Amino acid sequence: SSYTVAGRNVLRWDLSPEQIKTRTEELIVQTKQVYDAVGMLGIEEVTYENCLQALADVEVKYIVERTMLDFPQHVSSDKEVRAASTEADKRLSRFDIEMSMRGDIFERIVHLQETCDLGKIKPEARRYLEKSIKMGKRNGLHLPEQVQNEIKSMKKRMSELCIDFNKNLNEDDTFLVFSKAELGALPDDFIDSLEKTDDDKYKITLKYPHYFPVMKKCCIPETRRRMEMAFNTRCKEENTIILQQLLPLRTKVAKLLGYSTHADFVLEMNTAKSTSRVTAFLDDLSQKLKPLGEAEREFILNLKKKECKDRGFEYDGKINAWDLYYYMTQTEELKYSIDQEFLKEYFPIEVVTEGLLNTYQELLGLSFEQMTDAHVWNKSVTLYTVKDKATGEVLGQFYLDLYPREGKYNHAACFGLQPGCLLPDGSRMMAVAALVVNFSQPVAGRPSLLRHDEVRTYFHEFGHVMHQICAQTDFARFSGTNVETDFVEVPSQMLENWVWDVDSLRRLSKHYKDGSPIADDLLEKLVASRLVNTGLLTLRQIVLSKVDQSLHTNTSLDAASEYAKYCSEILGVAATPGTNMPATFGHLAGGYDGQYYGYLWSEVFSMDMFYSCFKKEGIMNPEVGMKYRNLILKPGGSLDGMDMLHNFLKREPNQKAFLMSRGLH
Amino acid sequence: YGGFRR
Ligand SMILES: [Cl-]
Ligand SMILES: [Zn+2]
């Protein structure tokens, strides 16, 4: 029922390694029987029910069962369960390629669109046909036989290369040892949480809750250099081999499909359309930020020269890679009076969670309720039920996995577990999402205290959750966040604007000790500090976007040399010799290949919607919030990204709001 | 994965 919750979450999280492997074989056998039955139908025998409906019914049942098998590798605390989940992901990814390249299915779908009356079917069903045909041509099913076999074998190879690329980074356990003197200027609540060694030193891992605080606060330059070297050499040997094979395969596949480069191949499925649009977008933005980067680098060198003189260190007259985050932090303290370690005292995780849920219950017209004794994959995971405030319709559920642990996904993402699409019996499946982040642990007898950047990450990932829950389509392939890659980051970055509003920050903050709110002056300075270090921070994102474009455009290039090239030309901070940042670039194997520009590309759309609609008539306006849910989130992937922006803005988007928020133009 | 730039 659309107004109940019991029985609609069919996800089990107590699977053993043997059950994961058994369910994987069963899922492949049962799914292949559906594709085989459709393939056996005569061409003049296919209809809407025996072909389109039969495939749509198995796509939703497959992706839900697939979720229980390929998700434990990211969250489970049992390494054997994670290994069985990764093997299930490898086996199911090759199966996806086998089914996607069935010529008999392609012929019968093409024949169905030609004979069926497209006017008597839902417009989303029309989109299902043309997308399926377009996906078949992007697999070469209109090409001769032997080239299809080459594409298939190379697709299966790239599948295992991408899985092994992220598997190496997720299971890395590299750590360094430092003494108390080598960890100068680090606070005691960080030092007292590290593992002690036999010689009274401390173990520091390369994970985010350890790497960033060292690179931002530790006043020992050699300590930051050793950390930056180890961080940008993770899996350097094995992942360079993978990149040296994956990138030529992507080019070789794009050639056989008729495309010049792999970047052109993936750009056709994005709102940017062409690579020449991405180049002009990145280059024009890089030129606007060039004066800001020069002024910020000059201020950083002055900070480094004075500190080397005060502390008696040697001064090399340059900004090394291990100096960037350290003096960016000083720029925030000196130019904007912002102490992140003091400001986090006003952001205990329970107050931030309460304010986060309350902000979007009121804005989106939703009702959140935490479930007790919830079936979860880890003890620290909580479950919430989402209802429509007016009708009481149970839209979906989401999990909160907030704290880091061994073997857990170390970045910050949102996972779609169940799509909010239609079921074969006519009912609607309850959407399910999971917010997976690694926030600060509760230490020193205090609750978890989040820095402002962690609060902004909390709002970003919750935007993906709201997109997954509010999306309601007919087909699973259009549900959730199955939109253009350069558009999926619009709902997430849109909700980041609420951590830069004074009244919104006042509802998110309460001191962990005495419960007092943040002072008015400090609250004003926090909002005014939104553009601190924005020159170099954005230039580094352009560097990553240019490297991602270059590695998928030019053939026979050294990944480390191309990254060091743009670091010196664009960012002005040289890459450390001996490192290999592209070997750690997980986006190149996590669906963002040739598409990392989409973050900056999406920010133009989110800033335009926030400034032109929310910021003009109240950012908590329920009318504007409901219009944002129905036009941006609810359609999911059933409409083009540009079409949904047109319906919300009643015009075309432009960079005026984007450039104004960046202090440009 | 479905979340956070580098
Ligand atoms: Cl084949
Ligand atoms: Zn995101």
Q: Measured between CB atoms, does A479 come within 8 Å of chain B?
A: no
With CA atoms as reference, report the closest residue to A186 among A383, A386, A329, A374: A329
Estimate the crossing angle of helix A53-70 against helix A79-100, to 10 degrees: 160
Residue B1 Cα to ligand 2 middle (Å): 9
Contact A499, A505 (CB under 8 A): yes
Residue A277: CB atoms within 10 Å = 15
Would you tell me which residues 440-469 of chain A have a C-beta closer than 8 angstroms to some C-beta of chain B? Answer: 457, 460-461, 464
Token pair 């009244």 is found at A503
Q: Phi/psi at A326 (nearest 5 deg)?
A: -70, -45
The letter for the amino acid at A272 is A
Contact between chains at B1 and A460 (C-beta distance less than 8 A): no
Contact A135, A227 (CB under 8 A): no
Distance in angstroms (rounded) separating the CA atoms of residues A652 and A394: 34
Q: In what order do the strands lie in the sheet with A366-370?
A: A366-370, A382-388, A394-401, A431-436, A413-418
β partners of residue A115: none
- Residues of A with catalytic roles: 461
Tell me how far the alpha carbon of residue A109 is from its chain's centroid.
33
Task: Kindly report the CATH number that applies to the domain delimited by A1-100+102-138.
Answer: 1.20.1050.40
Residue A392: CB atoms within 10 Å = 10
The residue count for chain A: 665
What is the DSSP secondary-structure string of A343-386? HGGG-BHHHHHHHHHHHHHHHTTEEEEEPSS---SSTT-EEEEE
What is the DSSP secondary-structure string of A526-551? HHHGGGTTHHHHHHHHHHHHHHHHHH
Quick one: resolution in A? 2.1
Task: Measure in Å the smallest separation between the Cα of A38 and chain B Cα atoms.
Answer: 31
Q: Phi/psi at B3 (nearest 5 deg)?
A: -170, -150
**Residue A454: both structure tokens together:** 């962690």
Give residue ranges of B with CB < 8 Å to any A CB.
1-6
Contact between chains at B2 and A415 (C-beta distance less than 8 A): yes
Distances (CA, A) of A500 to A202, A455, A495, A665: 36, 11, 10, 22
Per-residue exposure over A108-123, b if at least 16 CB sit within 10 Å of its own CB, e if not? bbbbbeeebeeeeeee
Q: Which residues contact A572 (CB under 8 A, 6 or more apart)?
A: A293, A294, A297, A319, A536, A539
Distance in angstroms (rounded) separating the CA atoms of residues A64 and A416: 10
Contact A43, A344 (CB under 8 A): no
With CA atoms as reference, report the closest residue to A229 among A584, A596, A543: A584
Closest CB to B1 among A415, A492, A585:
A415
Which of A587, A593, A595, A597 has the most B C-beta neighbours within 10 Å, making it the best mutation to test the interface with B?
Answer: A587
**Residue A116: both structure tokens together:** 């069926």
Distance in angstroms (rounded) separating the CA atoms of residues A232 and A239: 12
Per-residue exposure over A22-35, b if at least 16 CB sit within 10 Å of its own CB, e if not? ebbeebbeebbebb
Chain B CB contacts of A400 below 8 Å: none
Q: Which residues contact A9 (CB under 8 A, 6 or more apart)?
A: A397, A418, A430, A432
Q: Measured between CB atoms, does A413 come within 8 Å of chain B?
A: yes
Which helix (H) or strand (E) is A394 found in, with range?
Answer: strand A394-401
Token pair 């005014």 is found at A528
The residue count for chain B: 6
Nearest chain B alpha carbon to A491: B3
Token pair 């950390």 is found at A227
* A464 marked as part of a ligand binding site: yes
Distance in angstroms (rounded) separating the CA atoms of residues A491 and A131: 23
Contact A579, A229 (CB under 8 A): yes
Q: Which residues contact A60 (CB under 8 A, 6 or more apart)?
A: A419, A421, A422, A423, A424, A429, A475, A476
Closest CB to B4 among A74, A457, A596:
A457
Contact A512, A345 (CB under 8 A): yes
Task: Measure in Å the smallest separation between the Cα of A590 and chain B Cα atoms.
Answer: 6
**Residue A403: both structure tokens together:** 């704290």
Distance in angstroms (rounded) separating the CA atoms of residues A503 and A480: 31
Contact A294, A306 (CB under 8 A): no
Q: Phi/psi at A433 (nearest 5 deg)?
A: -130, 170
With CA atoms as reference, report the closest residue to A303 among A315, A288, A290: A315
CATH topology of domain A345-486+494-520: Collagenase (Catalytic Domain) (3.40.390)
Q: Measured between CB atoms, does A481 come within 8 Å of chain B?
A: yes
Contact A383, A397 (CB under 8 A): yes
Sign of CA dihedral A565, A486, A629, A70: negative
Q: Which residues contact A128 (CB under 8 A, 6 or more apart)?
A: A52, A56, A475, A477, A478
Which helix (H) or strand (E) is A390 found in, with range?
Answer: none
Would you tell me which residues 173-212 of chain A have a C-beta closer than 8 angstroms to some C-beta of chain B? Answer: none
Q: Is A498 helix (H, G, I), strand (E, B) or coil?
A: helix
Contact A166, A586 (CB under 8 A): yes
Distance in angstroms (rounded) separating the CA atoms of residues A205 and A192: 14
Q: Is A436 helix (H, G, I), strand (E, B) or coil?
A: strand
Breaks, C-N > 2.5 A, in chain B lie after 4
Tell me how far the alpha carbon of residue A280 is from its chain's centroid.
24
Distance in angstroms (rounded) separating the CA atoms of residues A349 and A440: 9
Residue A81 Cα to ligand 2 middle (Å): 27
* A552 marked as part of a ligand binding site: no
Which of A464, A566, A593 has the most B C-beta neighbours within 10 Å, making it the best mutation to test the interface with B?
Answer: A464
Q: Which residues contact A79 (CB under 8 A, 6 or more apart)?
A: A407
Distance in angstroms (rounded) separating the CA atoms of residues A570 and A601: 18
Residue A339: CB atoms within 10 Å = 12
Enumerate the domain spans of chain A. Answer: 1-100+102-138, 173-231, 260-338+534-588, 345-486+494-520
Residue A142: CB atoms within 10 Å = 15
Per-residue exposure over A480-500, b if at least 16 CB sit within 10 Å of its own CB, e if not? bbbbbbbbbbbbbbbbbbbbb
First to last CA, chain A: 52
With CA atoms as reference, report the closest residue to A539 among A569, A575, A496, A565: A569
Residue A658: CB atoms within 10 Å = 20
Structure determination method: X-ray
Closest CB to A481 among B2, B5, B6:
B2
* A460 marked as part of a ligand binding site: yes
Residue A369: CB atoms within 10 Å = 13
Residue A490 Cα to ligand 2 middle (Å): 8
Which of A486, A489, A490, A538 has the most B C-beta neighbours within 10 Å, making it the best mutation to test the interface with B?
Answer: A489
Residue A154 Cα to ligand 1 middle (Å): 11
With CA atoms as reference, report the closest residue to A126 among A663, A638, A607, A570: A638
Contact A257, A151 (CB under 8 A): yes
Distance in angstroms (rounded) separating the CA atoms of residues A183 and A220: 7
Distance in angstroms (rounded) separating the CA atoms of residues A432 and A3: 15
Q: Is A330 helix (H, G, I), strand (E, B) or coil?
A: helix
Q: Phi/psi at A384 (nearest 5 deg)?
A: -130, 145
Residue A149 Cα to ligand 1 middle (Å): 4
Residue A18: CB atoms within 10 Å = 10
Contact A303, A311 (CB under 8 A): no
Contact A635, A644 (CB under 8 A): yes
